[PDB]
Amino acid sequence: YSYIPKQNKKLIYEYLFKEGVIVVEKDAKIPRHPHLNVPNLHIMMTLKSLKSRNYVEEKYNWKHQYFILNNEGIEYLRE
Amino acid sequence: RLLEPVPFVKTNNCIKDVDADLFIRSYATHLKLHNKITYPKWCTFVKTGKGRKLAPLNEDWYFIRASSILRRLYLHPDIGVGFLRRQFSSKQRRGVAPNHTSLASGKILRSILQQLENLGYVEQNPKKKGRRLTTKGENAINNFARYINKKVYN
Amino acid sequence: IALTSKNLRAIEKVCSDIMKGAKEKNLNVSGPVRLPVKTLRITTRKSPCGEGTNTWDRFELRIYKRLIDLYSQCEVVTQMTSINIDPVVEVEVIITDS
Amino acid sequence: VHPKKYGQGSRQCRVCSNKHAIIRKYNINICRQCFRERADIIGFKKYR
Amino acid sequence: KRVQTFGKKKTAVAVATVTNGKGLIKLNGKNLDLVEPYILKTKVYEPLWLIGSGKLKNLDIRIRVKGGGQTSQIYAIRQAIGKGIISYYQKYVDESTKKELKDVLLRYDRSLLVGDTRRCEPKKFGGKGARARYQKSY
Amino acid sequence: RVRTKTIKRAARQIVEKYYAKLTLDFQINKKITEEVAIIPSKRMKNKVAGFVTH
Amino acid sequence: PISKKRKFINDGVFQAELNEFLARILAEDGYSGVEVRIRELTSLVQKRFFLCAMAQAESLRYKLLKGLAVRRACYGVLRHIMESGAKGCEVIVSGKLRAQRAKSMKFRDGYLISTGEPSKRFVNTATRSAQLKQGVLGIKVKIMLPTSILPDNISVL
RNA sequence: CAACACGGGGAAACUCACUAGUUUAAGACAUUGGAUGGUGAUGCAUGGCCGUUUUUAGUUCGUGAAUGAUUUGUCUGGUUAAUUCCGAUAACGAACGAGAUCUUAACCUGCUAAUUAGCGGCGAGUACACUGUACUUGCUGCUUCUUAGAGGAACAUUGUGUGUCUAACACAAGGAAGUUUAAGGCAACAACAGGUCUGUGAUGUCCUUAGAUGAACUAGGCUGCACGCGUGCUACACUGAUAUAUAUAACGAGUAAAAUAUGCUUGCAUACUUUUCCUCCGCCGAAAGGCGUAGGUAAUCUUUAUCAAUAUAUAUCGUGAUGGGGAUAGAUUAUUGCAAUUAUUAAUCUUGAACGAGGAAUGCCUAGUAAGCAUGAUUCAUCAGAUUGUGCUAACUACGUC
């Protein structure tokens, strides 16, 4: 099956909220991720959704994305 | 040529008095006379490098190779198997490609080295690595060097 | 004490300063031994697509190693080296006799 | 997926993920077209 | 006791050590005899003959040679022998005699006194040689 | 061989402000030129000393 | 541990990765290089590891993005560089210039040496890509500043 | 020209864009619109970067002067590496390029230095025959050599010719060096519709985007072969091959998976320890190679105060496609890898082709070059007949002219 990764998505949002920034590899082909348990595909999909909804700003360099969290994302996660 | 009118004082006691080749051939003849070593078995079918593609042509070769090994041992007391392989190394004809260097046959070298150790003229040092000559080995080489030095003199 | 940098001027400057520093606390030093230069050598074709002429250039990243060593207790040499440093010089201390 | 712990698809440029022309000398994984841009900032000087 | 001087052709360097002695001449682990080619032996015996061996029998010589091939090394040795003869005659014998001796050597050739100046020109792209090119075509 | 306008420019300034300082010898002129003028390279300073001597 | 050759090159790669990242962000004032607004930059870098030519070029590309006429914008930027004490400057804009046939325009003033080690030491350069809807224009700013010691003088009182 | 061992493009897979076919959502955002990715189309839309023009010597401004475009400066002449200088000169003053300038190498340091380099000094032996010579094991003022900093040294120095007798050239002497000491790096003005969007998250437009021209997987293909052209290698032999022997060098380069263990039925499930790159050394192997282990983040260990091959010596052919030569082919045992077959690569024996010094043509080269001989590095899971470096053996012939 395709699967919907709700537990991973929720955990990534918690991580995002706590930090205020996230620095990770752009690619989703490699599964293993070293700085948090969830595979890279989960992080890429969720960050893409967040970027379109504009909770996060991209700066980018050399296939790393350099995402800074906006104030509206902080308000959403807390409640 | 064979006898020389040198402008300096020679040592008259050691391996650098005598010509290297004359020493090797003469000492090899002495080793054969003595009956110091044998092939053994597998060493009958050798070629020194792979690309030689003939038996060693001069017939007295095994004793010559042994003698050549003994001269190198007097020079360097830190030797191991890889040193012998490199020492006796040559070029290998690659046919329709240029030549490249190739190490000499290692089993016959190992056989001579080990057999000489068993016959007491060389000794493995495991600390400060490598086979050297024994003092008995050195004395025999020096005695032979003096004998040859005497023969060139008279 | 071993001094490494890829910065030529900074290693050279620090060496004179640590020697000067050593005589201040009257330490017994051997004169500075400049160790063989290590070069990161890259031979690069100039054409980016490899089209046209076979133009090659040779790039060098040259790293400097130097040694100055001391017959002293550990505490004086470590404290003196630690205060005197400049940021691009990477320093390691080597222990010696009493 | 197929084994890629050896062979051409195991390796790519750090800067741009190129599938050819990678300089693996000194184990930094950069393609020559990238490398000429960055060699001064990495530290390299030219003399020949 | 001891004085040192030297020779330098291409990569090769020969340092010659001239001691007070009895007429022994050595090359690292070897007697002076063991050069091998008759031609290049004759070249290093040449300055010894030009002075005469009865003027060299109060000194022992040992030489240490590193670098280069045989032809380059023998010229470095001949320079090292030349300078060795000269340094002994300046340090032990007599400076005026050394100048006189140096003149005889120098008139014969400057090559023992002043080494070869030739050094390799480095390879460039587009050919096997330094200046030489791979074949052009149309 | 031949010497450039810059080499000549320094040499021309010399004599004009240092007429009686100079001597026939090249080595002393090298010292005088070095004393009077700050020339950044030895080769360049020697060339100027040379031309001033000429 | 790793060799000195590996260590210093890996440091170089990290410095390179940081410098290009900084150069892509760059706005108000020139970046300072590695430490051996700031809160956000620091936090990203810690996470990863656990007037000048570039500014003038970036300013000029910003004016180009704003759609201003090339001659006035380039002269203004060139003037500020010369006025602020440059001994030469050269500015090139390449590409469409809002036309269907690509071209370039050079704006140089002062001495602007190209030769020997004074050029390499004292001329600072910056390249910038300016995106429009007809594609991309290349700005090149070069500034000469020798103001260690000057290349030409005969040095008499 | 400035294509054609060029695309760092040394393709079993991966690679790859192709072919035979098979899959997938990793389709943001609010059926559906909407966009996201694309070694897709377009270098005759473009950015970058590079080749050429041209590595020769050229270029421009200020002011002045001479329907105007324009010209002068920026030149009769001398001289030169050179728009380099002099010199004359409606111009006088400039700037760029040239030169200077950076990296080596050359020489000299009674100065700067001794570690992970050497030397002496001295204990200990084994030989020689000593109140020295030779050779190995133990300990520890000298810096010449090894290393690497700073500083010196050539300026046409001196003499003599030729020269506006200026700029400068020629010869000799001196000298480490005389042509700017030798070699590179370096790279104006202005172009070319030169090449590259098959390197880029540089990029317009156009194509494409769910029985995808994206990502991915399985084969096959890039190398097939009547035939034509590049570029190299190996050859055509006695100034040589064959077998033994002597001599010797410089640049380098060296960190997420395997092994071992447990439970179950090669297979499945789990743990844990280290294998990982260079290989000394010690055994075993004709040979490739195998096994056991050591030392190395490196001037230290691999290993380089000794790692090479042509050289050169004694032997064997005795000149006959010959024992030159290794095409072409068969049987092997190995090594790498999932897979080795369209000989992967390796060795052993056997198989023993053409080639009798090359037409018309045409390449490179003036001093350690040219040529010959090797060898490190690059790609690399696996491999040099390639490129790029590095050493050694060390020529000829002008030394000028259009």
Tokens 């000398």 correspond to D25
Q: Which residues contact C6 (CB under 8 A, 6 or more apart)?
A: C61, C62, C63, C64, C88, D43, G8, G12
What amino acid occupies position C50? G
- Distance between CA C2 and CA C95 in Å, rounded? 11
**Nucleic strand H near CB of residue F32 (< 7 Å):** no
Residue G124 contacts residue G53 (beta carbons within 8 Å): yes
Tokens 């969830």 correspond to A38
A 12-71 near D (Cβ less than 8 A) = 62-63
- Distance between CA G157 and CA G154 in Å, rounded? 10
Residue D29 contacts residue D11 (beta carbons within 8 Å): yes
**Nucleic strand H near CB of residue E54 (< 7 Å):** no
- Distance between CA A40 and CA A42 in Å, rounded? 5
Residue C30 contacts residue C67 (beta carbons within 8 Å): no
**Nucleic strand H near CB of residue D5 (< 7 Å):** yes
HSE, CB side, 13 Å, CA atoms: give it for residue B43.
18
- Distance between CA C38 and CA C19 in Å, rounded? 24
The chain D residue lying nearest C39, using CA atoms, is D44
- Contact flag for A and G (3+ C-beta pairs < 8 Å): yes
Residue B21 has φ and ψ, to the nearest 5°, of -65, -50
What amino acid occupies position B73? L
Closest CA to B27 of B153, B103, B121: B121
Residue G22 CA: distances (Å) to CA of D44, F39, G15: 20, 41, 10
- Distance between CA D28 and CA G6 in Å, rounded? 9
Instruction: Please list the residues that pair with G129 across neighbouring strands.
Output: G138
Chains that touch G (3 or more CB pairs under 8 A): A, C, D, F
Query: What was the elucidation method?
Result: cryo-EM
- Beta-sheet pairing, G123-132 with B100-102: unpaired
Closest CA to G9 of A24, C13, C4: C4
**Structure tokens given for B139:** 């004395």
3-state class (DSSP) for residue G104: strand
Q: List % helix, strand, coil for chain E (3-state, nearest 5).
A: 45, 20, 35
Label residues E97-126 b or e (16+ Cβ within 10 Å = b): ebeebbeebeeeeebbeebeeeeeeeeeee
Residue B122 contacts residue B131 (beta carbons within 8 Å): yes
Instruction: Find chain D residues with C-beta within 8 A of A62's C-beta.
Output: 14-15
